[PDB]
């Protein structure tokens, strides 16, 4: 035993680095002969060296004596109260800023992220607590995946761990101490960790057997193919016989196009007259809304230089009264600009009324008088301007400042009297034709004004803030009082006469109309040219044009979810109108609640448009009008989707989640990590009730909306599948709350002047009453007591105790190797012996949230990494099972493409195409149903499926978290209803009767199946059920039905037999479809009322197909392109925009909109003072050759259009090179002639090698600004390394941030110093070369670079490498006339990168051409199209 101990002490005696504290640990280490003490001092040595590399790597002072944070601040003299006992690894105190460091090692990813978020939550607790002791805390977590360090070699450490593990093999150690929980925890903690985990005990406590018994209750799952057919035929015959006087006929009808219009016009008859002329509509429209009234009317430099200079100088450092001095300078500039702001809009966009200005000026002059005469004011002005001029000497000067020296020359001889004497002398309805752009231009100006008004800094009569926007030789002013991001009251006014219009909106919703002026008009023109018929010319096109323009402008002027949902129900309605058989309950889901009298006007416009489009004599064509109406809906897709209200949307999504639960009757209250008797009993009872589902054999069978699957149909399905025939200060604020509640009760003379008081008492009550109802945890899954600890981070414990007891009193009136070994060596809590309910660590803890979608708030389920891995295991197991099948279509592009081909082929033969959407696919499904359909299968090649069964059972008992905002709002509502509108909905009564007991926080039920958590299981089940139902229908009527399913929206294709049947017998077809509805409803596959069947359109995955061509679907992609401008480096922003435009042009959207959207994006970049370099965004005025072309191709195209003749010589030399780039002249000579070090001498030698030399004295004269020539642009080394490392707010706020960062410290230099863009512009200013732009791109300028400014980059080298990449990528026609293998190859070429970053024919060249430049789309593209005939003939 002691031989290998002497070998490992010899090993430490050889391979240890010389450290004194490690010689102290070596001194206590080598004197130990006990193996547990050798393991403790050895792992303490290793984790101690981890703390050495952590504290020395992060610069923190090492905590060796296990000093707490209160000990750290206690030794520094910072008095803290009794806080949480946390022992950090390293600490560093710098003034009032403390830095804490904690490090750990984990082998498994779940314990790594788990201890990561546990230590993250503890350091956020210390962050808020020491923030309440006024200390800015900087937490640092150094989590390491390996046991390596900077002290012991790798194989020596592996020999150490294999030596200690070679000491763990003896039995007397584990028999003596360190029992099998800590022994398996230690031995598995030192492992290198998986399907079918088997290191468990599987203590099923008589519960799994009961569920298996309830699953095999009456299901045969063993029948042959002779009883199934007879059973199905008998049941269908009984159903048909019942369909005469019994069942509700499946609620299927037959379209009467005129009746649908007469029902849509009379729909929603709250207050709408069904007689509206176009002229009266326009008259009401141009005077409808105050914003709408602001446009459609009959309206009719030294100051801005000073304003900008003052802003930029005030921003950084100058002082800290300052605003007073700046406003005084503004008044002097205005009074000297006598011969257009009047209220003197000062810095930060604020104005003063010229009255208190004189008063505080008198006060300042009197204070300066007592400092013992107008010259002292001028002297202060020179002091301030001198500080300004030196701060601008730093890097600015007279950079386009246009002679700010006026206040230096004129007022030297000068006066309050002059100022006041200069200040003292200083309908809404119209007819603007709907043919010009003035309306849209005014809308764009107002939208830009709002978006820029969002940028208020908010530091520290009419003292509100103002923004400016100009017009056709006039200058308006927007006024707003409250800053921030919330909806406010805005006022548009002028200075001439009144014109003070007012409204109340939200600024961050008006983004999609900032610079869109020629885009929308072209969309409208295309939509109308789509309707160039031979019948609607009789005075109808102008009405349609006015209607579409009014619709667009009303949508863009008023963003509201109501109009969005209205036009979505409109696309559903038109899909139903064009079809053959629609659902009877359709119009119930098309009517909505509309308010504010604007949505009613929108509905009147839509009704008139539908009447003008779908009147008599339409039988000429139908495709164009259908496409037009679809485009009007996806024109409602223009509205920004940014959750206009958070709390109401969360309440609504939670209500949609919970209503079907209480309708069933299995809502549970918070359990605690265990399994009591009553909940298991009611679980089994409701699982049995889930299977009752009385069929049509009874007298009340077709309930048609109740969840639950019938036992007989499930048994039939399982039997047909197993047979080879289916698929083959606290006290004072609390007393303030109490006295204000007393006021609310009795003292009502002062009605409401306590808004801020209302907020603070609301927050106090919500934090206080929820402090006594902590809804106990004991799981520590990173989110159980956050907000209650934020509110509690500044409060004492006994304080909370006395507050909660006094508030309930006043509320009753109106009515050991455990801890020292955890942090060093072994991991966190690991899965242990689990019951049939949970993993013995939790109970599959999930949490709910809402998702932003243009249609409706989708539900989202989020969980821990452990649960995520369990669900991923179930997911890919069922994914393998489904890939063994073929009918499914979720993610495999091959089968989806096959579905598209089959759909096209079927529609081309004028057959019937059934569409199907399933309502409430989330809640109506159930994991128990999955367990029951799985347990009754065969699946020949077994054992190991019991693990899958218990995993699926873990989902049977799962928990969801109610957000704290919801329960706080419910408590406020209950208090308001108890102290002081009687519309108690089911959820409110549920919350109230729960509050009578204990408040609920966690919910557990049966039929939840959180969306996305079990996606592939749902796909598998839906595939099986759809195939079985189609087989049943083909057996009943002798037909053939194909199906394609995506787990929510499915399509079905009927053969010629069913089409002939529909053409011959409508009654049998209606009976067959009602029987399909009955079958799909017996199993939990409820059909949504939006499902329509017909032979004109096919609805699948938001892609519509008709006979002939396919729907171009323009406006959806147009409005998508107008959106999504985030806060990134504008190169990546242009990448994203070009990708979206490439998808759009892969579609049917006419090219002319590509160029317009790109011009809009370039204008948005121009407005942000960001140099329009050529490599930023693609060329414009594009040819129709967006096919077979990459982004590099379009960059090459714009450079060739930008260079008249040199590109021709470059193309000639490159063709001669590519002819020599073949065998015999391999790239080794070229890669050795790379020469990316000094200059373009490589190309000089290449062109002089085989002919024409380049035209010098003009080639180097062309160069562009690469601002990221040394480092990327920061905002608060090639790209290959970024790809290797990646291998392992609102939308308007993004644009606001983009404009903010591009003005502040953004770019840095080769000296590790930050600077501005205007810094570079003031650095060049000329010096042999001026911008020399061409069509809006400020590019192409240099004379002879050869040491002060290296930000430039020649055009010829970039064009050369990009042309080489484009040529080797695709084709050789581009020179005409108008994953891991790459890593291995980069390791082969780059010698020093082998020890720095390790973790065929032309690949060497393409990877070589990426180390120098970073934006030429190489790595991104390495790892169908519909074009018009005329645009193709326009191609070159
Ligand atoms: Mn659908």
Per DSSP, the residues of 531-597 read T--SSTTTT-HHHHHHHHHHHHHHHHHS--HHHHHHHHHHHHHHHHHHSSB-BTTSGGGT-----TT
Centroid of ligand 1 to alpha carbon of 846 (angstroms): 28
Kindly give, in sequence order, each residue whose CB lies less than 8 Å from that of residue 1307, ignoring residues fewer than 6 positions away: 1267, 1268, 1273, 1274, 1314, 1315, 1316, 1317, 1319, 1320
CA-nearest of 1405, 1339, 1313 to 1176 is 1339
CA geometry: angle 269, 272, 275, nearest 5 deg = 120
3-class DSSP assignment, residue 1045: strand
Kindly state the tokens that stand for 1066: 């409508």
Report residue 960: phi and psi, to 5°: -120, 150
H helices of 1083-1186, in order, are 1114-1122, 1130-1146, 1151-1166
Report the distance separating Cα 1363 and Cα 1375, nearest Å.
8
Centroid of ligand 1 to alpha carbon of 1088 (angstroms): 10
CA dist 931 → 196, 215, 223, 645 (Å): 18, 8, 20, 39
3-class DSSP assignment, residue 379: helix
Kindly state the tokens that stand for 934: 């799985």
CA dist 1385 → 887, 966, 1410 (Å): 41, 56, 13
DSSP 60: P
Report the distance separating Cα 455 and Cα 1090, nearest Å.
44
Q: Which residues make beta-bridge pairs with 1041?
A: 1054
Report residue 1105: phi and psi, to 5°: -130, 140
285 touches 432 (CB < 8 A): no
CA-nearest of 1188, 1132, 1099 to 575 is 1099
Report the distance separating Cα 966 and Cα 972, nearest Å.
10
- Residue 26 a catalytic site member: no
- The binding site consists of 51, 89, 102, 917, 1049, 1099
Tell me the domain boundaries of the chain.
2-189, 258-293+518-644+1109-1120, 302-423, 438-509, 730-815+965-998, 1202-1434
788 touches 767 (CB < 8 A): yes
Report residue 913: phi and psi, to 5°: -125, 105
CA-nearest of 639, 512, 440, 524 to 1152 is 524
Number of other CB atoms surrounding residue 536 within 10 Å: 19
Instruction: Give 565-568's long-range contacts (Cβ < 8 A, gap of 24+).
Output: 565/592, 565/856, 566/592, 566/594, 566/599, 566/602, 566/603, 566/606, 566/636, 567/606, 567/632, 567/633, 567/635, 567/636, 568/633, 568/636, 568/855
Instruction: Give 130-136's long-range contacts (Cβ < 8 A, gap of 24+).
Output: 130/69, 130/73, 130/80, 130/98, 131/793, 132/793, 132/794, 133/73, 133/78, 133/80, 134/96, 135/73, 135/78, 135/96, 135/97, 135/98, 136/96, 136/97, 136/98
**Buried/exposed 964-991: b ≥16 CB within 10 Å, e otherwise:** bebbbbbbeebbeeeeeeeeeeebeebb
Report the distance separating Cα 765 and Cα 970, nearest Å.
13
User: Residue 370 belongs to what H/E stretch?
Assistant: none
Kindly give, in sequence order, each residue whose CB lies less than 8 Å from that of residue 502, ignoring residues fewer than 6 positions away: 290, 489, 490, 491, 492
Kindly give, in sequence order, each residue whose CB lies less than 8 Å from that of residue 69, ignoring residues fewer than 6 positions away: 80, 83, 86, 88, 91, 100, 126, 130
Q: Which residue has the tokens 């119930």?
A: 588
Report the distance separating Cα 1279 and Cα 1386, nearest Å.
13
DSSP 1273: P
3-state per-residue secondary structure call for 838-871: CCCCCCCEEEEEEECCCCCCEEEEEECHHHHHHH
1404 touches 1227 (CB < 8 A): yes
Report the distance separating Cα 774 and Cα 1002, nearest Å.
12
CA dist 881 → 195, 876, 886, 922, 1016 (Å): 16, 8, 10, 22, 10
3-class DSSP assignment, residue 136: strand
- The binding site for Mg(2+) consists of 1049
CA-nearest of 269, 267, 287, 285 to 277 is 285
Kindly state the tokens that stand for 756: 């801020």
Centroid of ligand 1 to alpha carbon of 604 (angstroms): 27
3-class DSSP assignment, residue 170: coil
Centroid of ligand 1 to alpha carbon of 238 (angstroms): 32
Furthest-apart CA pair in the chain: how many Å?
116
Architecture of domain 2-189: 2-Layer Sandwich (3.30)
Angle between helices 730-745 and 755-769 (to 10 degrees): 110
Report the distance separating Cα 496 and Cα 796, nearest Å.
60
Centroid of ligand 1 to alpha carbon of 628 (angstroms): 19
59 touches 156 (CB < 8 A): no
1031 touches 1024 (CB < 8 A): no
Kindly state the tokens that stand for 950: 């218990």
CA-nearest of 367, 344, 364, 346 to 459 is 346
Q: Which residue has the tokens 């983009």?
A: 1298
Centroid of ligand 1 to alpha carbon of 256 (angstroms): 23
Report the distance separating Cα 607 and Cα 629, nearest Å.
12
Q: Which residues make beta-bridge pairs with 1308?
A: 1314
Instruction: Give 856-862's long-range contacts (Cβ < 8 A, gap of 24+).
Output: 856/565, 857/643, 857/649, 857/652, 857/653, 857/656, 858/1011, 859/653, 859/656, 859/657, 859/922, 859/1010, 859/1011, 860/1011, 860/1012, 861/960, 861/1010, 861/1011, 861/1012, 861/1013
Cα torsion angle, 1263, 1265, 1266, 1270, sign: positive
Radius of gyration of the chain (CA): 37
CA dist 233 → 380, 693, 714, 1034, 1075 (Å): 101, 20, 16, 11, 11
Burial of 94 (0-12, 13-18, 19+ CB in 10 A): exposed
- The binding site for Mn(2+) consists of 51, 89, 102, 917, 1049, 1099
1434 touches 1184 (CB < 8 A): yes
Report the distance separating Cα 864 and Cα 850, nearest Å.
18
Report the distance separating Cα 578 and Cα 890, nearest Å.
28
Number of other CB atoms surrounding residue 256 within 10 Å: 10
Report the distance separating Cα 762 and Cα 969, nearest Å.
10
CA geometry: angle 733, 737, 742, nearest 5 deg = 145
790: Cα separation from own chain's centroid: 26
Centroid of ligand 1 to alpha carbon of 68 (angstroms): 59
By DSSP bridging, strand 97-105 and strand 136-144 are parallel
CA-nearest of 905, 1418, 988, 983 to 1192 is 1418
Centroid of ligand 1 to alpha carbon of 1102 (angstroms): 7
Half-sphere exposure of 1279 (CA within 13 A, CB side): 16
Report the distance separating Cα 843 and Cα 840, nearest Å.
8
1295 touches 451 (CB < 8 A): yes
Centroid of ligand 1 to alpha carbon of 556 (angstroms): 27
CA-nearest of 1264, 1224, 1245, 1249 to 1362 is 1264
Q: Which residue has the tokens 């009569």?
A: 461
511 touches 1291 (CB < 8 A): yes
CA geometry: angle 1343, 1345, 1349, nearest 5 deg = 115
Centroid of ligand 1 to alpha carbon of 915 (angstroms): 7
Kindly give, in sequence order, each residue whose CB lies less than 8 Å from that of residue 836, ignoring residues fewer than 6 positions away: 204, 205, 207, 208, 211, 950, 953
1165 touches 1172 (CB < 8 A): yes
1169 touches 1302 (CB < 8 A): yes
596: left (phi > 0), else alpha (psi -120 to 50), else beta?
left
Kindly state the tokens that stand for 1315: 């600077």
By DSSP bridging, strand 1002-1003 and strand 846-851 are unpaired
Centroid of ligand 1 to alpha carbon of 1028 (angstroms): 21
Q: Which residue has the tokens 């979206």?
A: 1140
Report the distance separating Cα 245 and Cα 708, nearest Å.
25
Q: Which residue has the tokens 């007592």?
A: 370
Report the distance separating Cα 85 and Cα 83, nearest Å.
6
CA geometry: angle 851, 856, 861, nearest 5 deg = 30
Report the distance separating Cα 1336 and Cα 1171, nearest Å.
10
Angle between helices 1015-1037 and 927-935 (to 10 degrees): 60
H helices of 786-852, in order, are 786-790, 797-812, 819-822
Q: Which residues surround ligand 1, an ion (CB under 5 A)?
A: 917, 1049
Q: What is the dihedral of CA 1244, 1246, 1247, 1251, to 10 degrees?
A: 140
Resolution in units of Å: 3.9
Instruction: Give 395-402's long-range contacts (Cβ < 8 A, gap of 24+).
Output: 395/1315, 395/1316, 395/1319, 395/1322, 396/312, 396/1316, 396/1318, 396/1319, 396/1322, 397/1322, 399/1318, 399/1321, 399/1322, 400/1318, 400/1321, 401/305, 401/309, 402/301, 402/302, 402/305
1006 touches 675 (CB < 8 A): no
Catalytic: which of 26, 44, 115, 350?
115
Please measure the distance between the N-terminal and C-terminal CA atoms of the chain and give it in whole angstroms.
Answer: 85
Kindly state the tokens that stand for 1137: 């925009």
1399 touches 1284 (CB < 8 A): yes
Kindly state the tokens that stand for 1302: 């591009």
CA-nearest of 1055, 1048, 1113, 1121 to 1087 is 1048
Instruction: Give 519-523's long-range contacts (Cβ < 8 A, gap of 24+).
Output: 519/1118, 519/1122, 519/1153, 519/1156, 519/1157, 519/1160, 520/440, 520/552, 521/437, 521/440, 522/1152, 522/1153, 522/1156, 523/1114, 523/1115, 523/1118, 523/1153
Centroid of ligand 1 to alpha carbon of 669 (angstroms): 36
Number of other CB atoms surrounding residue 781 within 10 Å: 19
DSSP 488: E
CA dist 1258 → 195, 1204, 1246, 1263 (Å): 66, 12, 18, 11
Q: Determine the number of helices (DSSP H) and then strands (DSSP E) in the chain.
A: 57, 22
User: Residue 330 belongs to what H/E stretch?
Assistant: helix 322-336
């Amino acid at each position: 035993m002691e031989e290998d101990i002497a070998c490992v002490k010899d090993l430490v005696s050889k391979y240890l680095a010389n450290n004194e504290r490690l010689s102290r640990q070596k001194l206590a280490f080598l004197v130990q002969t006990e193996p547990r003490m050798l393991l403790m001092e050895g792992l303490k040595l290793l984790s101690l060296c981890i703390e050495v590399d952590s504290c020395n790597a992060n610069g923190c002072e090492h905590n060796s004596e296990d000093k707490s944070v209160e000990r750290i601040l206690h030794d520094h003299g910072v008095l803290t109260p009794s806080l949480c006992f946390v022992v950090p690894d390293g600490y560093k105190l710098t003034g009032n800023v403390l830095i804490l460091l904690e490090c750990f090692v984990r082998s498994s990813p779940a314990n790594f992220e788990q201890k990561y978020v546990e230590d993250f939550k503890k350091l956020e607790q210390l962050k808020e607590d020491l923030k309440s002791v006024d200390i800015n805390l900087i937490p640092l977590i150094d989590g390491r995946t390996s046991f390596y360090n900077e002290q012991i070699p790798d194989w020596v450490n592996d020999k150490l761990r294999d030596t200690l593990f070679s000491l763990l093999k003896y039995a007397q150690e584990s028999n003596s101490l360190f029992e099998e929980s800590e022994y398996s925890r230690l031995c598995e903690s030192l492992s290198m960790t998986v399907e079918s985990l088997n290191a468990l005990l599987d203590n099923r406590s008589n519960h799994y057997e009961e569920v298996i018994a309830s699953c095999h209750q009456g299901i045969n799952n063993k029948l042959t193919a002779h009883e199934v057919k007879l059973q199905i035929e008998e049941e269908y015959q009984v159903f048909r016989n019942r369909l005469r006087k019994g069942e509700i006929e499946g609620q299927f009808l037959k379209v009467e196009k005129n009746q649908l219009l007469n029902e849509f016009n009379n729909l929603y008859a709250d207050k709408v007259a069904e007689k509206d002329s176009v002229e009266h509509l326009t008259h009401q429209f141009k005077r409808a809304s105050p914003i709408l009234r602001f446009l459609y009317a009959n309206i009719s430099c030294q100051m801005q230089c000073w304003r900008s200079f003052l802003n930029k100088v005030k921003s950084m450092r100058i002082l800290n009264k300052l605003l007073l001095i700046f406003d005084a300078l503004i008044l002097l500039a205005s009074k000297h600009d006598q011969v257009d702001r009047l209220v003197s809009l000062e810095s930060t966009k604020k104005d003063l009324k010229k009255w208190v200005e004189r008063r505080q000026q008198v006060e300042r002059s009197r204070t300066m008088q007592s400092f013992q005469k107008n010259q002292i004011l001028n002297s202060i002005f020179q002091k301030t301007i001198s500080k300004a001029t030196t701060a601008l000497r730093d890097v600015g000067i007279s950079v386009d400042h246009y002679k700010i020296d006026m206040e230096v020359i004129c007022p030297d001889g000068y006066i309050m009297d002059f100022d006041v004497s200069g200040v003292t002398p200083t309908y809404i309805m119209g007819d603007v034709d709907l043919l010009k752009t003035t309306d849209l231009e005014r809308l764009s100006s107002l939208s830009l004004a709002l978006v820029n008004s969002m940028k208020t800094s908010s530091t520290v009569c009419k003292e509100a803030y103002c923004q400016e926007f100009s017009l056709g030789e006039t200058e308006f002013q927007l006024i707003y009082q409250k800053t921030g991001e919330c909806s406010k009251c805005y006022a548009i006014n002028d200075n001439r006469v009144g014109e003070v219009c007012s409204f109340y909106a939200d600024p961050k919703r008006y983004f999609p109309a900032i610079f869109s002026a020629e885009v929308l008009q072209t969309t409208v023109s295309t939509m109308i040219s789509w309707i160039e018929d031979c019948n609607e010319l009789e005075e109808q096109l102008d009405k349609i044009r006015s209607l579409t323009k009014m619709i667009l402008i009303l949508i863009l002027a008023h963003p509201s979810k109501r109009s969005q949902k209205l036009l979505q129900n409109l696309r559903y309605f038109i899909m139903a109108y064009v079809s053959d058989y629609y659902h009877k309950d359709l119009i119930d889901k098309v009517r909505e609640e509309l308010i504010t009298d604007v949505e009613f006007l929108l509905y009147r416009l839509l009704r008139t448009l539908m009447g003008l489009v779908l009147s008599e004599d339409v039988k000429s064509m139908m495709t164009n009008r259908f496409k037009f109406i679809l485009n009007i809906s996806y024109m409602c897709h223009f509205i920004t989707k940014e959750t206009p209200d958070r709390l109401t949307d969360q309440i609504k999504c939670f209500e949609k989640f919970l209503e079907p639960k209480v309708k069933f009757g299995h809502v549970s209250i918070n359990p605690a990590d265990t399994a009591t008797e009553e909940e298991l009993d009611d679980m089994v009872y409701n699982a049995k009730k889930f299977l009752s589902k009385g069929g049509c054999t009874s007298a009340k069978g077709p309930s048609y909306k109740k969840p639950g699957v019938s036992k007989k149909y499930l048994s039939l399905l399982t039997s047909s599948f197993n047979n080879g025939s289916l698929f083959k200060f606290n006290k004072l604020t609390a007393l303030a709350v109490s006295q204000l509640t007393e006021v609310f009760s009795r003292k009502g003379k002062h009605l409401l002047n306590k808004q801020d008081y209302e907020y603070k008492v609301q927050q106090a009550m919500s934090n206080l009453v929820l402090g006594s109802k902590q809804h106990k945890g004991d799981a520590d899954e990173a989110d159980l007591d956050e907000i209650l600890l934020d509110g509690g981070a500044s409060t004492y414990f006994n304080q909370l105790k006395e507050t909660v007891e006094k508030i309930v009193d006043q509320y009753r009136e109106p009515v050991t190797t455990a801890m020292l070994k955890n942090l060093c060596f072994y991991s966190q809590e690991s899965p242990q012996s689990y019951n049939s309910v949970g993993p013995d660590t939790g109970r599959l803890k999930f949490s709910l949230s809402y998702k932003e979608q243009v249609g409706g708030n989708r539900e989202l389920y989020i969980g821990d990494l452990r649960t995520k891995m369990f669900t991923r295991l179930i997911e890919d197991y069922f994914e393998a099972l489904s890939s063994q099948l073929s009918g499914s279509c979720l993610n495999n592009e091959k089968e989806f493409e096959n579905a598209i081909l089959s759909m096209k082929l079927n529609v081309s033969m004028a057959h019937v195409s059934y569409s199907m959407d399933h309502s409430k696919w989330g809640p109506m499904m159930c994991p128990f149903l999955f367990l029951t359909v799985l347990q009754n299968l065969i699946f020949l090649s077994i054992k190991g499926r019991d693990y899958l069964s218990t995993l699926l059972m873990w989902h049977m008992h799962k928990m969801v978290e109610i957000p704290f905002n919801v329960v706080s709002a419910m408590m406020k509502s209950f208090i308001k209803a108890q102290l002081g509108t009687k519309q108690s909905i089911t959820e409110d009564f549920f919350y109230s009767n729960f509050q009578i007991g204990v408040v609920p926080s966690h919910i557990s039920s049966i039929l939840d199946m959180g969306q996305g958590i079990l996606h592939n299981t749902s796909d598998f089940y839906a595939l099986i059920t759809e195939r079985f139902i189609n087989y049943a229908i083909s057996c009943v009527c002798g037909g053939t039905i194909d199906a394609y399913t995506s787990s929510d929206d499915q399509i079905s294709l009927f053969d010629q037999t069913l089409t002939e049947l529909l053409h011959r017998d409508p009654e049998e077809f209606r009976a067959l479809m009602e029987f399909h509805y009955y079958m799909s409803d017996q199993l939990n596959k409820f059909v949504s009322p939006k499902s329509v069947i017909g032979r004109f359109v096919a609805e699948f995955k938001s892609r519509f197909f008709v006979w002939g061509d396919e729907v171009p679907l323009l406006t959806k992609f147009v409005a998508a392109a107008l959106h999504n401008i985030k806060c990134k480096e504008p190169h990546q922003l242009a990448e994203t925009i070009d990708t979206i435009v490439d998808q759009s042009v892969a579609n049917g959207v006419p090219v002319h909109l590509c160029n317009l959207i790109q011009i809009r994006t370039l204008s948005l970049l121009q407005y942000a003072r960001y140099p329009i370099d050529p490599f930023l965004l693609n060329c414009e005025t594009d040819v129709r050759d967006w096919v077979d072309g990459n982004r590099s191709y379009r960059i090459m195209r714009q450079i060739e259009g930008l260079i008249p003749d040199a590109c021709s010589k470059i193309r000639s030399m490159l063709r001669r090179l590519y002819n020599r780039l073949k065998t015999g002249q391999l790239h080794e000579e070229f890669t050795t002639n790379y020469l990316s070090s000094e200059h373009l001498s490589s190309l000089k030698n290449l062109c002089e090698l085989l002919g024409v030399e380049p035209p010098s004295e003009s080639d180097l004269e062309y160069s562009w600004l690469n601002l990221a020539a040394h480092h990327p642009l920061r905002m608060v080394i090639p790209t290959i390394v970024k790809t290797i490392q990646n291998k392992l707010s609102s939308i308007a706020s993004g644009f606001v941030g983009l404009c903010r960062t591009l003005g502040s410290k953004c770019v840095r230099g080769p000296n590790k110093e930050n600077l501005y863009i205007k810094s570079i512009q003031s650095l060049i200013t000329g010096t042999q070369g001026i911008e020399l732009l061409t069509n809006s791109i400020g590019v192409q300028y240099w004379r002879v670079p050869l040491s002060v400014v290296s930000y430039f980059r020649p055009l010829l080298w970039d064009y050369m490498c990009i042309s080489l990449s484009t040529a080797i990528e695709l084709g050789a026609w581009v020179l005409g006339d108008p994953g891991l293998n790459h890593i291995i190859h980069s390791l082969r070429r780059l010698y020093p990168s082998v020890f720095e970053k390790h973790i065929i024919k032309f690949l060497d060249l393409c990877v070589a051409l990426d180390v120098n430049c970073e934006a030429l789309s190489l790595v991104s593209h390495i790892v169908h199209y519909i074009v018009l005939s005329s645009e193709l003939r326009f191609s070159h």
